[PDB]
Every structure is written in C-alpha cells, then in structure tokens.
Amino acid sequence: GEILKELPEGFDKETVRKQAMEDIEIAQSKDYESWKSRFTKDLQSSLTEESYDSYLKILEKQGEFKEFGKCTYLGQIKDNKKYGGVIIVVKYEEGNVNYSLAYDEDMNLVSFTM
Amino acid sequence: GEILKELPEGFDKETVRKQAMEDIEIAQSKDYESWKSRFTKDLQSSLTEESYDSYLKILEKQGEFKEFGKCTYLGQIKDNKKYGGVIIVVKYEEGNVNYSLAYDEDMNLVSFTM
Amino acid sequence: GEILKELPEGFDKETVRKQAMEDIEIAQSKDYESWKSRFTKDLQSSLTEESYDSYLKILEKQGEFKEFGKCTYLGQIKDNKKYGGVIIVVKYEEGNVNYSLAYDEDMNLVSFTM
Amino acid sequence: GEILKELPEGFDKETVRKQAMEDIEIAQSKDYESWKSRFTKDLQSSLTEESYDSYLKILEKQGEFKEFGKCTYLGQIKDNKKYGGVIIVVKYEEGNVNYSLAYDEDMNLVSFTM
Ligand SMILES: [Cl-]
Ligand SMILES: [Cl-]
Ligand SMILES: [Cl-]
Ligand SMILES: [Cl-]
Ligand SMILES: [Cl-]
Ligand SMILES: [Cl-]
Ligand SMILES: [Cl-]
Ligand SMILES: [Cl-]
Ligand SMILES: [Cl-]
Ligand SMILES: [Cl-]
Ligand SMILES: [Cl-]
Ligand SMILES: [Cl-]
C-alpha cells in the first residue's frame, strides 16, 4: 500500500472539498439514514446508529456551526484501489474542529471522523 | 491551528518510529493498564477498557505479528501546542494494517488508531 | 532551517497562485527590469540581464503559452524567516514546464526557476 | 504529469539519501567527468563544464564541508516515468545549503541544483 501527501489520480480538490462540506452538513442534520447513504454500498452495513449518536453527543457540545475553514488533502492506495482524503476545519461557536473524511473514486465515504 | 505534512519542530523521525513500535507492542500485549499509561496524564481518564477490548477483538482477526513496515510522518499545531504523528505499517499474517499514532512533545500518546 | 510540505504561516494558497501566475507572465513579457523589480530589494543586485536572457532563449523554444496547470505548495524556514513556495505547471505548445517560485512574507520573489 | 510530496513507487528513502550524499561528494571533488557520468545517458550531452565550473565558484565561497543534514523527499511523474527527489541540507563552514537532486528509477541523476 501507499500513504500519499496529496490526492491520488482521479480525485480533484474542488470536488473533494465540495463533497466534504455537503457530507459534514448531512452529519450535522442528525438524519442517520441520509448520513449512512453517503458511504460506499459495501461499508453501510458496517455502520451503527449508536456510533453516529455518540458523534451527535460530542457535536452538540460545539455549539452552532459558524463556517468551513482550510482543507488539507491526503491519499491512500490500499489493495490497488485509490482513496482521497481531506482534513477540513469546521468552525463552531465553541471552537475549531478538524474533520477527517476519505472517499473512494465514486466519491462515496469510506471514513468519517470528527 | 495547522495540519503539517511532516513532524513539527522538537520531534524527530527515529524517536517517533521507535516509540510507535514500542507503543504498538504494548497495545498487542493485551495489558490495558500498560497501554493506558502510555497516554498523556490528562487523556488517560478519557480512555475505557471496553474501547481497548474492541480493538483487541479486531486485532485477534489479523493473526500473528510479522513485521513493522514503512512510516509516514505528519504533524499538527492545536491551541499553540505541537503534536507529532506517524502512520506506520504493521504486517500481520492476514495482511498489512496502517496504525495512526500521535504524540505530544513529551512523547506520550494523544491518539492511537488501528 | 526547515523544508516544509505546505505553505508556512502568513501565506495563503490563492494569493501565492495569483502572484506566481502574474510573475510568470512578467517573465514571459521579456521586460527584464519589471521582472527584476518583483524580487526582494536584497536580491535585485544579485540578478543579471544575461541570466534572464538565457531563460528567454529556453522559453522561446517552448512555443506559445497555452495554460496554467496545477500548483504544489511548499515552504521553508531559513534564518528564522518564512518563505512560501509553489511548483506551478505551465502548459506551452511544446509541452508542460514546471516553474519553482519562492516568496518572502511581503510576496516578493526570493527565487524563480524554470 | 504529477508533483508528489513523497517518493514515487520503486524508490526507497535510504537508497536516495546514500546516492545523494555520494553524488554531492562527487560534485565537491571538482571531477567534471565523474559528475557528468552520474547523470542519465540522454542528459549527459546537455551538460557543460562551464556550468559545472560556475557551481564550483559558488561552492568554494561556502568553505569546508562540515556535515549532511535533513532530507526532504519528493517525486514527479513526467511522460509516465517516475522521478524521486530529495532536498538535502549540506552544512558548510559559511552556512547551510539546500541541494535539490532528482533521480530516475535506475538511480541516475536527472537534475542537480545547489
Ligand atoms: Cl488527476
Ligand atoms: Cl486538484
Ligand atoms: Cl526539530
Ligand atoms: Cl527527523
Ligand atoms: Cl496563516
Ligand atoms: Cl491557504
Ligand atoms: Cl548583465
Ligand atoms: Cl519539468
Ligand atoms: Cl516502493
Ligand atoms: Cl522508503
Ligand atoms: Cl563546456
Ligand atoms: Cl538554501
């Protein structure tokens, strides 16, 4: 495998930033089924509502969403497949939070971490 | 804050790689209290044995430890404090696993992810 | 000193990209004095018209400017001062050329390489 | 094409660091023909003794070689071929100098800059 300090081939910054902002808004909506639907078909059945509700508990403590900040792009080659990652700053009333999201080439989530 | 694509000042690759290999060996030992003791004093009380046992469940499915592989170094500046990170390949009988570890300047864990 | 795999603090990607494209256009204009004036005061005396004319000779062999491509951002800390760098793709009729430009915090050139 | 913030596949850090230090020592030896011979066959005809002697003039002003410092690894994909790069610190009596060297997969120089 490989860890990349930029996006892999086939990914582009603007598409990744735009999808990450939409996917964080879907996570903040508290709609578990819409958030689950943003993951690759093969990983959806690996997700739980309990784990999502634990994220919502921590999320509520941040206060109101204020703005999106800077993006840091990364990548990974795992089992000859490419994954594009982004560390995006989300500014809440109680402070800045760094989200880590990763996508497959079809732009569906493989990972989502607050 | 800042996301860095190398270690911050005050960290060095050899020290970080050596500590990451020791800390992954302590995690594989199944000794929860020794593993907990490797985290910064302020984060120890945030850890649970249940979360560590969930890691041990996933770890057991990998088979026997075979070797350490390549290291990828990263960093973060959060609330004017520096954190050194490493993505290290751990080769098990069932395949390669990428661990993500982060340290404070005193070389105690702030994050540990399989 | 430090070589960084991102811009240092005080530099912004969008500002760097705009200045790099402007500065490469000034270099392509064949106006030596305007190009020289884009460098920090301390480095102006170090530049020669002969060296700039050698660049123009190599530049003419590329054909017509077609487009700017992708940017790769880097940085450097040298004698406690911060320098923001960019590797920018310049697409000419005869092919792609990677320019390396570096700036001081006042957004004046410290380095320019075709 | 691609600019990478790590070595491409097929390159190893330790091999690159050893070759870069060897190649900088050959450059410092003032042996033009040995230095030229370290470049890929296609690029040898492009080198001049005059350009190498200009480097030797600047090199002599640095004083005695003291030590090699840190390495920063980069890469490039150009016309579907992979190139591994290193920015290596060379500490001279008069101060630190950052050399930029790039290699093809056969570990022959494609670029050498002081
Ligand atoms: Cl691409
Ligand atoms: Cl892009
Ligand atoms: Cl340091
Ligand atoms: Cl180091
Ligand atoms: Cl900044
Ligand atoms: Cl920026
Ligand atoms: Cl002149
Ligand atoms: Cl080039
Ligand atoms: Cl490899
Ligand atoms: Cl390596
Ligand atoms: Cl000659
Ligand atoms: Cl330098």
Side-chain angles (χ1 to χ4, degrees), chain A residues 20 24 28 55 58-59 62 67-69 71-72 74 86-92 94-101 111-114, chain B residues 1-4 75-80 83 111:
Chain A
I24 289 158
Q28 292 166 349
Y55 154 76
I58 298 151
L59 174 66
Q62 305 311 306
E67 208 188 67
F68 286 102
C71 277
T72 306
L74 300 167
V86 68
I87 307 173
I88 181 167
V89 174
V90 184
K91 317 184 170 171
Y92 296 100
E94 293 310 316
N96 294 326
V97 170
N98 296 293
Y99 279 79
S100 302
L101 277 66
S111 183
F112 184 106
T113 290
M114 200 206 195
Chain B
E2 288 168 75
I3 307 290
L4 308 176
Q76 186 180 358
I77 294 157
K78 184 198 164 201
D79 188 23
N80 281 106
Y83 302 93
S111 183

Short mmCIF file of all heavy atoms in Angstrom, two decimals, chain A residues 20 24 28 55 58-59 62 67-72 74 86-92 94-101 111-114, chain B residues 1-4 75-81 83 111, unseen atoms left out:
data_model
loop_
_atom_site.label_atom_id
_atom_site.label_comp_id
_atom_site.label_asym_id
_atom_site.label_seq_id
_atom_site.Cartn_x
_atom_site.Cartn_y
_atom_site.Cartn_z
N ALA A 20 -17.11 17.10 0.88
CA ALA A 20 -16.82 17.06 2.32
C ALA A 20 -17.74 18.05 3.06
O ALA A 20 -18.28 17.73 4.11
CB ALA A 20 -15.35 17.38 2.58
N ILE A 24 -20.53 16.83 5.71
CA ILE A 24 -20.50 17.28 7.12
C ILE A 24 -21.87 17.91 7.45
O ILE A 24 -22.36 17.70 8.55
CB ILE A 24 -19.30 18.21 7.43
CG1 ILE A 24 -18.00 17.39 7.42
CG2 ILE A 24 -19.49 18.98 8.76
CD1 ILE A 24 -16.75 18.24 7.18
N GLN A 28 -24.36 16.80 10.41
CA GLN A 28 -24.94 17.76 11.38
C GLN A 28 -26.47 17.75 11.38
O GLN A 28 -27.06 18.22 12.34
CB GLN A 28 -24.45 19.19 11.13
CG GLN A 28 -22.96 19.40 11.42
CD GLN A 28 -22.43 20.70 10.85
OE1 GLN A 28 -23.08 21.41 10.05
NE2 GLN A 28 -21.24 21.04 11.24
N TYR A 55 -21.34 10.53 18.14
CA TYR A 55 -20.81 11.69 17.41
C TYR A 55 -21.74 12.92 17.63
O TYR A 55 -21.25 14.02 17.87
CB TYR A 55 -20.63 11.37 15.91
CG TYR A 55 -20.71 12.60 15.03
CD1 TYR A 55 -19.64 13.49 14.94
CD2 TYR A 55 -21.86 12.89 14.29
CE1 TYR A 55 -19.72 14.64 14.15
CE2 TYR A 55 -21.96 14.04 13.51
CZ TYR A 55 -20.88 14.90 13.43
OH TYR A 55 -20.97 16.03 12.64
N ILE A 58 -21.15 14.57 21.07
CA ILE A 58 -19.93 15.39 21.05
C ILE A 58 -20.17 16.65 20.19
O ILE A 58 -19.74 17.74 20.59
CB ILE A 58 -18.69 14.55 20.55
CG1 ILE A 58 -18.40 13.38 21.52
CG2 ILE A 58 -17.44 15.42 20.41
CD1 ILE A 58 -17.76 12.16 20.88
N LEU A 59 -20.88 16.50 19.05
CA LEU A 59 -21.22 17.59 18.13
C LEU A 59 -22.04 18.68 18.84
O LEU A 59 -21.72 19.86 18.68
CB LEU A 59 -21.97 17.09 16.88
CG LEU A 59 -22.50 18.17 15.90
CD1 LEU A 59 -21.37 18.92 15.23
CD2 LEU A 59 -23.44 17.56 14.87
N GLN A 62 -20.34 21.53 20.77
CA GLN A 62 -19.57 22.51 20.00
C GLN A 62 -20.33 23.81 19.76
O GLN A 62 -19.73 24.83 19.43
CB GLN A 62 -19.16 21.94 18.63
CG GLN A 62 -18.39 20.62 18.68
CD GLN A 62 -17.25 20.65 19.65
OE1 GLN A 62 -16.38 21.53 19.59
NE2 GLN A 62 -17.27 19.71 20.57
N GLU A 67 -18.67 28.34 10.27
CA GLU A 67 -18.04 28.42 8.95
C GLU A 67 -17.15 27.21 8.66
O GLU A 67 -16.69 26.55 9.60
CB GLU A 67 -17.12 29.67 9.04
CG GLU A 67 -16.82 30.42 7.77
CD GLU A 67 -15.76 31.48 7.98
OE1 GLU A 67 -14.59 31.12 8.26
OE2 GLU A 67 -16.10 32.68 7.87
N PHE A 68 -16.85 26.95 7.36
CA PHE A 68 -15.83 25.97 6.97
C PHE A 68 -14.54 26.72 6.83
O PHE A 68 -14.55 27.86 6.37
CB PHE A 68 -16.16 25.22 5.66
CG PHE A 68 -17.25 24.19 5.82
CD1 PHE A 68 -18.55 24.46 5.39
CD2 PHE A 68 -16.99 22.96 6.42
CE1 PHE A 68 -19.56 23.50 5.55
CE2 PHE A 68 -18.01 22.02 6.60
CZ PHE A 68 -19.28 22.29 6.16
N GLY A 69 -13.44 26.11 7.26
CA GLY A 69 -12.12 26.69 7.13
C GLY A 69 -11.29 26.00 6.05
O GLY A 69 -11.84 25.50 5.06
N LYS A 70 -9.97 25.94 6.27
CA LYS A 70 -8.96 25.36 5.37
C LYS A 70 -9.09 23.84 5.21
O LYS A 70 -9.56 23.14 6.10
CB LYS A 70 -7.55 25.67 5.89
CG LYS A 70 -7.17 27.13 5.75
CD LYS A 70 -5.76 27.39 6.31
N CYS A 71 -8.60 23.35 4.05
CA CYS A 71 -8.56 21.94 3.67
C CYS A 71 -7.14 21.49 3.52
O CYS A 71 -6.35 22.21 2.90
CB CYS A 71 -9.30 21.71 2.36
SG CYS A 71 -11.07 21.52 2.56
N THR A 72 -6.83 20.27 4.01
CA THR A 72 -5.56 19.55 3.83
C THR A 72 -5.90 18.25 3.12
O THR A 72 -6.68 17.48 3.63
CB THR A 72 -4.86 19.29 5.18
OG1 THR A 72 -4.70 20.51 5.88
CG2 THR A 72 -3.54 18.58 5.01
N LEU A 74 -5.01 14.48 1.35
CA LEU A 74 -4.16 13.30 1.51
C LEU A 74 -4.73 12.19 0.66
O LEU A 74 -5.78 12.34 0.04
CB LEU A 74 -4.08 12.86 3.00
CG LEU A 74 -3.53 13.87 4.02
CD1 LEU A 74 -3.82 13.41 5.45
CD2 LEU A 74 -2.01 13.97 3.91
N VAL A 86 -9.40 14.22 3.05
CA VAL A 86 -9.38 15.64 3.35
C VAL A 86 -9.54 15.84 4.85
O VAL A 86 -10.34 15.18 5.49
CB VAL A 86 -10.40 16.46 2.50
CG1 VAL A 86 -11.85 16.15 2.88
CG2 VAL A 86 -10.12 17.96 2.60
N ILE A 87 -8.72 16.73 5.39
CA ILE A 87 -8.81 17.22 6.76
C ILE A 87 -9.34 18.63 6.59
O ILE A 87 -8.70 19.47 5.96
CB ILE A 87 -7.51 17.12 7.58
CG1 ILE A 87 -6.95 15.65 7.52
CG2 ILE A 87 -7.82 17.59 9.00
CD1 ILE A 87 -5.59 15.46 8.14
N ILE A 88 -10.58 18.86 7.01
CA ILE A 88 -11.23 20.16 6.81
C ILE A 88 -11.59 20.75 8.17
O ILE A 88 -12.06 20.05 9.07
CB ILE A 88 -12.46 20.07 5.84
CG1 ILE A 88 -13.15 21.45 5.61
CG2 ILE A 88 -13.44 18.96 6.25
CD1 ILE A 88 -14.17 21.46 4.42
N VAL A 89 -11.30 22.03 8.32
CA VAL A 89 -11.59 22.79 9.53
C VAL A 89 -13.06 23.16 9.52
O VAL A 89 -13.55 23.69 8.53
CB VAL A 89 -10.69 24.04 9.68
CG1 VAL A 89 -11.11 24.90 10.87
CG2 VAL A 89 -9.22 23.66 9.79
N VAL A 90 -13.75 22.88 10.62
CA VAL A 90 -15.14 23.29 10.80
C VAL A 90 -15.15 24.20 12.04
O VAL A 90 -14.71 23.78 13.12
CB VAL A 90 -16.17 22.15 10.85
CG1 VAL A 90 -17.58 22.70 10.93
CG2 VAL A 90 -16.04 21.24 9.63
N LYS A 91 -15.53 25.45 11.85
CA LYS A 91 -15.53 26.44 12.94
C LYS A 91 -16.91 26.48 13.60
O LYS A 91 -17.90 26.77 12.93
CB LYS A 91 -15.11 27.85 12.44
CG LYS A 91 -13.93 27.84 11.47
CD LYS A 91 -13.48 29.24 11.07
CE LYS A 91 -12.18 29.23 10.31
NZ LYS A 91 -11.87 30.56 9.75
N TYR A 92 -16.98 26.08 14.88
CA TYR A 92 -18.20 26.11 15.69
C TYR A 92 -18.06 27.23 16.70
O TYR A 92 -16.95 27.76 16.88
CB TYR A 92 -18.47 24.77 16.41
CG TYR A 92 -18.74 23.61 15.48
CD1 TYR A 92 -17.73 22.69 15.18
CD2 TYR A 92 -20.00 23.40 14.93
CE1 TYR A 92 -17.98 21.61 14.33
CE2 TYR A 92 -20.24 22.35 14.05
CZ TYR A 92 -19.23 21.44 13.77
OH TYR A 92 -19.46 20.38 12.92
N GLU A 94 -18.01 27.06 19.91
CA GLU A 94 -17.08 26.71 20.98
C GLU A 94 -15.62 26.51 20.49
O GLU A 94 -14.73 26.30 21.30
CB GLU A 94 -17.55 25.46 21.76
CG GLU A 94 -18.82 25.66 22.56
CD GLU A 94 -18.88 26.88 23.47
OE1 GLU A 94 -17.88 27.15 24.18
OE2 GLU A 94 -19.93 27.56 23.47
N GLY A 95 -15.40 26.62 19.18
CA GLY A 95 -14.07 26.47 18.59
C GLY A 95 -14.02 25.67 17.31
O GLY A 95 -15.02 25.13 16.84
N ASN A 96 -12.81 25.59 16.75
CA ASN A 96 -12.46 24.88 15.52
C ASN A 96 -12.37 23.37 15.76
O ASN A 96 -11.84 22.92 16.77
CB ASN A 96 -11.10 25.39 15.03
CG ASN A 96 -11.11 26.83 14.59
OD1 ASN A 96 -12.09 27.34 14.04
ND2 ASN A 96 -9.98 27.50 14.79
N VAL A 97 -12.87 22.59 14.80
CA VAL A 97 -12.87 21.12 14.84
C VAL A 97 -12.33 20.63 13.51
O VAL A 97 -12.77 21.11 12.47
CB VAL A 97 -14.31 20.58 15.14
CG1 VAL A 97 -14.38 19.07 14.95
CG2 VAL A 97 -14.76 20.96 16.55
N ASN A 98 -11.38 19.69 13.54
CA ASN A 98 -10.79 19.13 12.32
C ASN A 98 -11.47 17.80 11.95
O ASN A 98 -11.26 16.79 12.63
CB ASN A 98 -9.28 18.91 12.46
CG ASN A 98 -8.47 20.17 12.63
OD1 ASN A 98 -8.35 21.01 11.75
ND2 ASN A 98 -7.83 20.28 13.76
N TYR A 99 -12.25 17.79 10.88
CA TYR A 99 -12.87 16.56 10.41
C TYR A 99 -11.96 15.84 9.41
O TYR A 99 -11.36 16.51 8.57
CB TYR A 99 -14.21 16.85 9.73
CG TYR A 99 -15.39 17.04 10.66
CD1 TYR A 99 -15.58 18.25 11.33
CD2 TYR A 99 -16.41 16.10 10.72
CE1 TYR A 99 -16.73 18.50 12.07
CE2 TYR A 99 -17.56 16.33 11.47
CZ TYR A 99 -17.72 17.53 12.14
OH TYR A 99 -18.85 17.76 12.87
N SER A 100 -11.90 14.50 9.46
CA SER A 100 -11.14 13.68 8.50
C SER A 100 -12.11 12.80 7.75
O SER A 100 -12.77 11.96 8.36
CB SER A 100 -10.09 12.82 9.19
OG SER A 100 -9.21 13.65 9.91
N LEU A 101 -12.21 13.02 6.44
CA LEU A 101 -13.09 12.27 5.55
C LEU A 101 -12.28 11.65 4.46
O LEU A 101 -11.33 12.26 3.98
CB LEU A 101 -14.16 13.21 4.93
CG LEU A 101 -15.42 13.50 5.75
CD1 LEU A 101 -15.10 14.30 7.01
CD2 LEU A 101 -16.42 14.30 4.94
N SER A 111 -14.64 6.62 5.18
CA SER A 111 -14.23 7.02 6.54
C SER A 111 -14.74 8.42 6.85
O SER A 111 -14.74 9.29 5.98
CB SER A 111 -12.70 6.98 6.65
OG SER A 111 -12.30 7.30 7.97
N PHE A 112 -15.15 8.62 8.08
CA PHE A 112 -15.68 9.91 8.55
C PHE A 112 -15.33 10.02 10.01
O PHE A 112 -15.85 9.23 10.80
CB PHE A 112 -17.21 10.01 8.32
CG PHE A 112 -17.83 11.35 8.68
CD1 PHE A 112 -18.23 12.24 7.69
CD2 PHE A 112 -18.08 11.69 10.01
CE1 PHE A 112 -18.81 13.47 8.03
CE2 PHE A 112 -18.66 12.91 10.34
CZ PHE A 112 -18.99 13.81 9.35
N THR A 113 -14.48 10.98 10.38
CA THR A 113 -14.05 11.17 11.77
C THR A 113 -14.05 12.65 12.14
O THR A 113 -13.55 13.49 11.39
CB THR A 113 -12.66 10.54 11.98
OG1 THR A 113 -12.81 9.12 11.90
CG2 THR A 113 -12.03 10.88 13.31
N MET A 114 -14.61 12.95 13.30
CA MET A 114 -14.65 14.29 13.86
C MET A 114 -13.35 14.59 14.59
O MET A 114 -12.82 13.68 15.27
CB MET A 114 -15.82 14.42 14.81
CG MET A 114 -16.20 15.84 15.04
SD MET A 114 -17.03 16.01 16.73
CE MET A 114 -17.80 17.78 16.40
N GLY B 1 -5.21 26.81 14.02
CA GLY B 1 -4.42 25.59 14.03
C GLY B 1 -3.74 25.32 12.70
O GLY B 1 -3.93 26.06 11.73
N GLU B 2 -2.94 24.23 12.64
CA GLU B 2 -2.24 23.81 11.42
C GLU B 2 -2.14 22.29 11.30
O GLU B 2 -1.89 21.61 12.28
CB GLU B 2 -0.80 24.37 11.39
CG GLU B 2 -0.63 25.85 11.14
CD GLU B 2 0.78 26.32 11.43
OE1 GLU B 2 1.69 26.04 10.61
OE2 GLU B 2 0.98 26.98 12.47
N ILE B 3 -2.29 21.78 10.08
CA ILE B 3 -2.05 20.39 9.74
C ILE B 3 -0.74 20.42 8.99
O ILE B 3 -0.59 21.21 8.05
CB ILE B 3 -3.18 19.70 8.94
CG1 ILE B 3 -4.54 19.87 9.64
CG2 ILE B 3 -2.80 18.20 8.70
CD1 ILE B 3 -4.74 19.07 10.96
N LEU B 4 0.21 19.58 9.42
CA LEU B 4 1.55 19.56 8.80
C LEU B 4 1.80 18.25 8.10
O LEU B 4 1.37 17.19 8.58
CB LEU B 4 2.66 19.82 9.88
CG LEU B 4 2.53 21.06 10.78
CD1 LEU B 4 3.66 21.09 11.82
CD2 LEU B 4 2.53 22.37 9.97
N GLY B 75 2.04 16.10 11.28
CA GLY B 75 2.05 16.94 12.48
C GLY B 75 0.82 17.80 12.57
O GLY B 75 0.01 17.88 11.63
N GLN B 76 0.67 18.42 13.72
CA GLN B 76 -0.46 19.32 13.97
C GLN B 76 -0.08 20.34 15.03
O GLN B 76 0.61 20.01 16.00
CB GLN B 76 -1.69 18.51 14.44
CG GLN B 76 -2.95 19.39 14.58
CD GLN B 76 -4.19 18.65 15.05
OE1 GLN B 76 -4.19 17.45 15.27
NE2 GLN B 76 -5.29 19.37 15.19
N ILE B 77 -0.53 21.56 14.83
CA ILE B 77 -0.42 22.63 15.80
C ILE B 77 -1.86 22.92 16.22
O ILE B 77 -2.71 23.20 15.37
CB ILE B 77 0.40 23.86 15.33
CG1 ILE B 77 1.87 23.41 15.13
CG2 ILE B 77 0.32 24.96 16.40
CD1 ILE B 77 2.67 24.23 14.24
N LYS B 78 -2.17 22.65 17.50
CA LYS B 78 -3.52 22.83 18.04
C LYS B 78 -3.42 23.58 19.36
O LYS B 78 -2.68 23.16 20.25
CB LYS B 78 -4.22 21.47 18.20
CG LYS B 78 -5.67 21.54 18.65
CD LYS B 78 -6.09 20.17 19.19
CE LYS B 78 -7.36 20.20 20.01
NZ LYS B 78 -7.46 19.00 20.89
N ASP B 79 -4.10 24.73 19.45
CA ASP B 79 -4.08 25.60 20.63
C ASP B 79 -2.59 25.94 21.01
O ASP B 79 -2.21 25.91 22.18
CB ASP B 79 -4.87 24.96 21.79
CG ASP B 79 -5.08 25.84 23.02
OD1 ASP B 79 -5.02 27.10 22.88
OD2 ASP B 79 -5.26 25.29 24.13
N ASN B 80 -1.77 26.26 19.98
CA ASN B 80 -0.35 26.62 20.05
C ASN B 80 0.57 25.52 20.60
O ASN B 80 1.75 25.81 20.89
CB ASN B 80 -0.13 27.93 20.80
CG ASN B 80 -0.46 29.11 19.93
OD1 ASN B 80 -1.50 29.77 20.10
ND2 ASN B 80 0.37 29.36 18.90
N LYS B 81 0.08 24.26 20.65
CA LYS B 81 0.88 23.11 21.09
C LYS B 81 1.17 22.23 19.88
O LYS B 81 0.35 22.18 18.95
CB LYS B 81 0.18 22.33 22.23
CG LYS B 81 0.04 23.19 23.50
CD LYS B 81 -0.67 22.47 24.61
N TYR B 83 2.07 18.55 17.95
CA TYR B 83 1.79 17.11 18.01
C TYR B 83 2.39 16.43 16.79
O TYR B 83 2.22 16.91 15.68
CB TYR B 83 0.27 16.85 18.10
CG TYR B 83 -0.34 17.52 19.31
CD1 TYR B 83 -0.90 18.79 19.22
CD2 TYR B 83 -0.28 16.92 20.57
CE1 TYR B 83 -1.39 19.45 20.35
CE2 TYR B 83 -0.78 17.56 21.70
CZ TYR B 83 -1.33 18.83 21.59
OH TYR B 83 -1.82 19.47 22.70
N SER B 111 -3.30 10.13 20.72
CA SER B 111 -4.19 9.42 19.77
C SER B 111 -3.56 8.10 19.36
O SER B 111 -2.35 8.02 19.16
CB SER B 111 -4.44 10.30 18.54
OG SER B 111 -5.33 9.65 17.65
#
